[PDB]
């Protein structure tokens, strides 16, 4: 149609237009100011209206990428803050653009944002509300250049709502703070999830991709039929693999169109798809990829008749490989909400190796015979770690949880740095209490959802700087293998103690005057040299020391002279627990 900025705008309004536009330019003018960027907003919008006005106007026939490129060429100290990314304005426009992706460092060397105090946020949030978020908003889309803009408008409209609650609020501080952290992580886990589907598509490839989408999509929408979650899985791929070659607009447009099948096929899909897709142009996406699991049939026959029975199977599987071992997964997902996906694929991946070492040998039948009961111990192993983990946080909190949990590590690989270990062991701890609360039924589904982050996290920071095989092991291992192997990972014996270092375990008194959440860290990290000094320690032992020290810090640190026993009845301490750990 004529004139795309007419249309975009339109069915999109001024006040996201706008909210989105210094997205996409905070994502590669990464090192201009932001009032640079409200320039160009300003600029862009004003010409956009032009063409809402008249779509035959000056430049409104011009396509969202051309425009877009030659104002990006506009920015005077492009070639002398950006240096090469300004010989991109020189190449025509296709070539232009994907030399702009090329470009748009992933990562920049920009400081940590910092939380300013609640009463000058509120104040400045009062003050001119608009530019205090819009100012954020640049903030965050320039420290992450792929965040998908759309999603980044959503995180701000629920940043704004925090505010507008918090600062009316009598406590404000006691608000707020609790609100912006859940809604920090939540951003964070967001990203991180981005990355990994982006960084799977191209390890494993498409085939990969695409059983991990047919399990999953299945497992959400298991009314609908094969073929149907067929086609979605393809379109879901095409967006997958070109949002992750970065291109916003092609990105926006595959999901716009992908959700627009899903409502217009939308009964036989979903029942629950009903509230997304009466949502707004923008949300649709989002929330579709939000909606909860429909209900099964409860009409469904047994996986043994097709898969087991019938002398078809090898026939069928061979007839075309993978759209009978999709079926399989389809099938098996279904009726399984509450199996993890890489639990499924470890399944489908059983089940193939065997119709393989089977479909060529003497009696196919009966050596596919007795498939199911292969797959028992692998439902099994996930189950157990989840309730004998959620068993445990039940019985000592979040807290004292983390605590067994960096003690098992830390005897695991001893050879990791001591904060990596206590970050890690935190953000584990953390899904125990994000988990552990869902009925069983959900729970697998949410501990494979957080976790598979909190390991790629790991898994990069080691890569980083390694140090131990297993641990590089694990992180090369198939990425679905990548969890039974952590959690295969035994005691290190080859490990050799770190030598006594009298002032690691010496403590002053700003431990009864900093926050809790950091009075800890500060514990944490003790534990950790502790179990490190002398791993042999038995759990008896060790919590001998734990409850020496527990005590010791309060009956001392509410004691008149608050820093006498510290180097004092500390000196007790540490002379009385290394007789007690020889
Ligand atoms: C995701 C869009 C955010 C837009 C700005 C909202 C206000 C953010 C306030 C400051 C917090 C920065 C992150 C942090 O909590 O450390
Ligand atoms: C240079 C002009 C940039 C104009 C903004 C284009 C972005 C349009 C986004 C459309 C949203 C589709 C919703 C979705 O898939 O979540
Ligand atoms: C405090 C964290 C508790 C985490 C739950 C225990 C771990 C269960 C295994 C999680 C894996 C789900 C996917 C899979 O089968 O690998
Ligand atoms: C920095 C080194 C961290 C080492 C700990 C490995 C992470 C294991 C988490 C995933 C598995 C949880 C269940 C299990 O321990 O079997
Ligand atoms: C060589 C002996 C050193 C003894 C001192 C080690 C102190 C370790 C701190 C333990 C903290 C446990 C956490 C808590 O008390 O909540
Ligand atoms: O800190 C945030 O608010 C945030 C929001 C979206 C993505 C990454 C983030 O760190
Ligand atoms: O990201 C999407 O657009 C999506 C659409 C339908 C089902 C699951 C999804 O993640």
Known sequence: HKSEVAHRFKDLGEENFKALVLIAFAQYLQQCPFEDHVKLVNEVTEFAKTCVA?????????????????????????????????????????????????????????????????????????????????????????????????????????????????????????????????????????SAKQRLKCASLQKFGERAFKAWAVARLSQRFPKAEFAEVSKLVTDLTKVHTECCHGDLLECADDRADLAKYICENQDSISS???????????????????????????????????????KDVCKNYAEAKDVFLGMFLYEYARRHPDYSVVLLLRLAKTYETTLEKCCAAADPHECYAKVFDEFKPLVEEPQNLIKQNCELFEQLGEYKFQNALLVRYTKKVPQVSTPTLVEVSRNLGKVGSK??????????????????????????????????????????????????CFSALEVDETYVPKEFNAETFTFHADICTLSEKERQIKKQTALVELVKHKPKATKEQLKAVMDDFAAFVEKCCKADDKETCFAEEGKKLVAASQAALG
């Open 272 to 310: 629950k798809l009903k509230e997304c897709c009466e949502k707004p142009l923008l949300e649709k996406s989002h929330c579709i990829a939000e909606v909860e699991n429909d209900e099964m049939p409860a009409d469904l026959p047994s996986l043994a008749a097709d898969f087991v029975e019938s």
């Open 54 to 190: 008249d779509e035959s106007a000056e430049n409104c026939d011009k396509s969202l990428h051309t425009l877009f490129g030659d104002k990006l060429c506009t920015v005077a100290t492009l070639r002398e803050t950006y240096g090469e990314m300004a010989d991109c304005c020189a190449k025509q426009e296709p070539e232009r653009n994907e030399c702009f992706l090329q470009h748009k460092d992933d990562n920049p060397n920009l400081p940590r944002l910092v939380r300013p105090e609640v009463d000058v946020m509120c104040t400045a949030f009062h003050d001119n509300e608009e530019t205090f978020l819009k100012k954020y908003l640049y903030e965050i889309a320039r420290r992450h250049p792929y965040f998908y803009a759309p999603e980044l408008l959503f995180f701000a409209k629920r940043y704004k709502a925090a505010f507008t609650e918090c600062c009316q609020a009598a406590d404000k501080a006691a608000c707020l703070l609790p609100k912006l952290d859940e809604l920090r992580d939540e951003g964070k886990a967001s």
């Open 435 to 484: 988990c552990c609360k869902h009925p069983e039924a959900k729970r697998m589904p949410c501990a494979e959802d957080y976790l598979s982050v909190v390991l790629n996290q790991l898994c990069v920071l080691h890569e980083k700087t390694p140090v131990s095989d297993r641990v590089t092991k694990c992180c090369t291992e198939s990425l679905v293998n990548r969890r039974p």
